[PDB]
RNA sequence: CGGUAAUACGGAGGGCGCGAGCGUUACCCGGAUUCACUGGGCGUAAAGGGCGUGUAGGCGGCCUGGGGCGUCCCAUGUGAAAGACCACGGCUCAACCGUGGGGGAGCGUGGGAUACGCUCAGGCUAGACGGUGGGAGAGGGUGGUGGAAUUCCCGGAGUAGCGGUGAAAUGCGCAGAUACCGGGAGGAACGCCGAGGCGAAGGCAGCCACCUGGUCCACCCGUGACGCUGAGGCGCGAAAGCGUGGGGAGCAAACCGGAUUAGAUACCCGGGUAGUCCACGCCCUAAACGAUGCGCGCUAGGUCUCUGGGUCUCCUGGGGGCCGAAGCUAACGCGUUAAGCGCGCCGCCUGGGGAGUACGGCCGCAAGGCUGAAACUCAAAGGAAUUGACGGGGGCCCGCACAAGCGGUGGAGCAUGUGGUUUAAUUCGAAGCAACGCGAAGAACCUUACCAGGCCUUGACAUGCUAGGGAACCCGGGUGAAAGCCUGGGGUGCCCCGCGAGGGGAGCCCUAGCACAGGUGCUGCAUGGCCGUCGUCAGCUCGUGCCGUGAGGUGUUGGGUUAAGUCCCGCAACGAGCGCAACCCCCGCCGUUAGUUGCCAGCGGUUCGGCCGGGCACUCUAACGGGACUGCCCGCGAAAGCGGGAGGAAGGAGGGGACGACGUCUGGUCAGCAUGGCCCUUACGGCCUGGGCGACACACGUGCUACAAUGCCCACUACAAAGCGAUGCCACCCGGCAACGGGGAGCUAAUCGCAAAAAGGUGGGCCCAGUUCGGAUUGGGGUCUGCAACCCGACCCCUGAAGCCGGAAUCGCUAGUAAUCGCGGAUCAGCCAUGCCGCG
RNA sequence: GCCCGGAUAGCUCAGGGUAGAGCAGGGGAUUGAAAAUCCCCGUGUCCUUGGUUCGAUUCCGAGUCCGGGCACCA
RNA sequence: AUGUUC
């Protein structure tokens, strides 16, 4: 029981909110709830698209949602039919009118959430974990990270004895607060239960 | 292997291997260099005999000759056939068979060779012995005799204790001890010298004499291989022990007493018999050890030391040590004093246990010794080194760890969590630290997981399919504690055939049917996620190099320094990473920006409160900056750093946060959530009313209030900070002793409100008392929240418990800390909050 | 008879204002647990009688029952 | 001085 959330630890400094609206005591409750049914819906529908973030701004009580995906192709559709329904789905579940923008994650191999998702997906499909891990870290570093770490939880290869295979390269100065360590976490659901996957990508300083 | 995902069980499919076969068991060889001739070993793994002496035996320097036994050569005989091997052939092949061919050690016979081994003969002098001359020595034996000490006896002198331990007592002592002195006895051992020396081993220590063994050196004088080893045999063999005698001071198994202890048949104390001593005779063992058989040769050196010799600053011999060449070694280590390189000879080993046991035999007075198995059993036993961890090991070093302090807990009441008991239920989890005011940041119903009873089933919730009706919605009627069951009505916007009949229609809702939902049911060793914890401890690693057969090591052992693997110095390492620190927030000094709702210094006015003008200066607010870095000075130091000083609001990490390395704990959580697997399906799901989680003979944790005078009560008067609030904070009136109730402004809040801060200060009262201390308990009468306060709420208003500072123990804190005093918040209708998180 | 002493909790024993250790039970405390160890409980006609005293288990005098020693018993 | 166990 230790190591605090490398995002939570940064926030004001180095790394920004995933939702930036204001609301007073009477309001926050309901907009936060929305935010959440929003993220939740997009979290499962845009799985194939490899989504890293779901940033949510909110102004004249109107809602813009930026979805930072690796595969905008997938969220869009051929000529944008899929993103049609997506804009209508959100509107169905929120009593409101919601801008849904896409944004290509330029390099998906520096997106901790994606790197993490990829390894998780690999595991879900009976891939060797140690290798999967080690490779993920090679990909991250090749893509110019100053350092990267990846951690698969336990029940690797299906064992009775749960474990925790880690693997890392470069600097990952978690105590350093100017660092800019993206962090990411996906599940592997398996016949044999869940393994969790943590990726840390270190990108630079100041 | 098998514990609920089993490539190891059983079956299936699939595969691999052989195939008229494939497996099994048994036995032999192999692997097994694990009986080692080829081809092993004995320092610590199993293995050097306890040491001499020596018999058989094994082995034997240099030269010359004779012999020709070994040995080698040639011929020749023999080595039957079959088999084996080569060729060619017969059965259609092959198996099987034929024919021919080459082998083959052995042994006989003849002839020959003579290097080596043997043998006979002669020779040599390098091995061995001897002569002469010198030497060192706890080598042995017998005799004596010297002083110190202990004990005892006789005295003297002197008196109250001595002795002894962790502490004591036993014991000795007034019948005179202990300490001191004189006289004497007797036994044992020899201080200093003293570390080395001698001996084959065991072992050997005052001095003197006699007897006696080994050994070294020199001259190079004599003999001339006379040598090495040595199964047996013979002798020697520590200590204990045995027999007969002696002797007996000190010591001291056993034993007796005293302690210690749970016991103490021990360790500590006081005594004490064998024995320890001597003679003679036995015993024959041992960690009898260098755990290393003896002899010889050969392979760098350095250094200390004993003892000889030397035209003596070094050489030369013999011993004893330490370090090391090459080499060996599993490693440790050994290394001209070999565990190296070699030859001779002896001894011994062959997994562990059983067991040095049994049986037998030999020896012994006995104790016992020697020789020495097997059954059965295990899958190891084991050596060395490595990384850890551990220590009632060491050094160095840290933390409120102790210590120094100050205040508490443990006692009392009560609050609260827990054990337990109880109950229909008292849901469930947390268990040393790191469970127990913990999950719970809010249990009357709800919560709520439990109990009772009454009710519901495609369901309180989801996705979707079939179908007559209904298709939104909304209202009452019975029966009920409520759920629910039964009921009767108001009444179709919408897509659309349409100008309508009438008729398609999608939401949506009920009925039945189908899939499915639901499960706080189990497993925290199936899990994720999150957390605790060691520990904010100073660590944990890596890349390449180098060291090691290797695990691994170095780096990161050392010296200094730091809060720190912080830094410095050093170094077969040079770097790096996760940690430390820094980057982030708060607090402390100042600046710039900004001037309302905040401030009010100087004005002017004034119903006093900055109220109005003005103004933002100061205070604030809050955003951005500056500022500290051992930077400067002195001293110490090689440096890092340290001591001190100055300036500065602030130093030596300025004070607090946030922050928790690789890992540990099969830690915690399936009951927050997620999740594999297991389980429930008119019930383990779901709804309700009521009860319970609040029970109380007990025990424990954390707290609160106290026991009072540095106090308590009443009046009056001050000085905060951080928060919170528009179905809420509530000013201010009024009524009420009061909780509160009626009114009722202001406040989307730097505006108005909660708000009184309390301790403090000033008055007064109490006068040491179970009290004007303390406020438990209990009776009544009220208030408020809420459908409802019986179990079970808080608050107000009129009994007055225990408790006179708390046993063994035990906690917190190092400075704006502890101690004490209040204030706010989350949860929340209300509150059992004395808790928690914060604020001053 | 005479002189001495004893009688205290269930047992074994300590002692002018006051009743105690010990053993056994039970709570605690210590330990990570368990033992060992430490602490706290509840227990009396203080033999009986009269005296002294404000107070007696304590001092006095008597008496009973024991123990020691000595008398002696019609 | 002593001071056991899992
Ligand atoms: Mg063999
Ligand atoms: Mg061998
Ligand atoms: Mg051994
Ligand atoms: Mg051995
Ligand atoms: Mg020997
Ligand atoms: Mg001979
Ligand atoms: Mg001769
Ligand atoms: Mg001569
Ligand atoms: Mg002997
Ligand atoms: Mg002897
Ligand atoms: Mg004798
Ligand atoms: Mg005897
Ligand atoms: Mg003794
Ligand atoms: Mg031996
Ligand atoms: Mg050496
Ligand atoms: Mg026998
Ligand atoms: Mg202390
Ligand atoms: Mg108490
Ligand atoms: Mg459970
Ligand atoms: Mg666990
Ligand atoms: Mg548990
Ligand atoms: Mg467990
Ligand atoms: Mg409770
Ligand atoms: Mg009292
Ligand atoms: Mg008093």
From Swiss-Prot:
GO molecular function: mRNA binding; rRNA binding; structural constituent of ribosome
Keyword flag RNA-binding: yes
Pfam family, one: Ribosomal_S3_C
GO biological process: translation
SMART domains xrefs: KH
Keywords, ordered alphabetically: Ribonucleoprotein, Ribosomal protein, RNA-binding, rRNA-binding
Stored InterPro entries: KH_dom, KH_dom-like_a/b, KH_dom_type_2, KH_sf_prok-type, Ribosomal_S3_C_sf, Ribosomal_uS3_bac-typ, Ribosomal_uS3_C, Ribosomal_uS3_CS
CC annotations in GO: cytosolic small ribosomal subunit
UniProt key word Ribosomal protein: yes
Gene3D superfamilies linked: 3.30.300.20, Ribosomal protein S3, C-terminal domain (3.30.1140.32)
Residue span, KH type-2 domain: 38-106
Subunit (UniProt): Part of the 30S ribosomal subunit. Forms a tight complex with proteins S10 and S14.
Family: Belongs to the universal ribosomal protein uS3 family.
Function: Binds the lower part of the 30S subunit head. Binds mRNA in the 70S ribosome, positioning it for translation.
The protein's name in its UniProt record: Small ribosomal subunit protein uS3
Gene for this chain: rpsC
């Amino acid at each position: 029981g230790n190591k605090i959330h490398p995002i939570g630890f940064r926030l004001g400094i180095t790394r920004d909110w995933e939702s930036r609206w204001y609301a007073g005591k009477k309001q926050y409750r309901h907009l936060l709830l929305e935010d959440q049914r929003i993220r939740g819906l997009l979290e499962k529908e845009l799985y194939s698209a490899g989504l890293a973030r779901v940033d949510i701004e909110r102004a004249a009580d109107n809602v813009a949602v930026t979805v930072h995906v690796a595969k905008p192709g997938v969220v869009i559709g051929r000529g944008g039919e899929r993103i049609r329904v997506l804009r209508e789905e959100l509107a169905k579940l929120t009593g409101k009118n919601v801008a849904l923008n896409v944004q290509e994650v330029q390099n998906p191999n520096l997106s901790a959430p994606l790197v993490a998702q990829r390894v998780a997906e690999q595991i879900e499909r009976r891939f060797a974990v140690r290798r999967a891990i080690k490779q993920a870290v090679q990909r991250v570093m090749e893509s110019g990270a100053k350092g990267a770490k990846v951690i698969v939880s336990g029940r690797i290869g299906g064992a009775e004895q749960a474990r925790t295979e880690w693997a890392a390269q470069g600097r990952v100065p978690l105590h350093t607060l100017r660092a800019n360590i993206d962090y990411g976490f996906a599940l592997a659901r398996t016949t044999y239960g869940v393994l969790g996957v943590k990726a840390y990508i270190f990108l630079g300083e100041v």
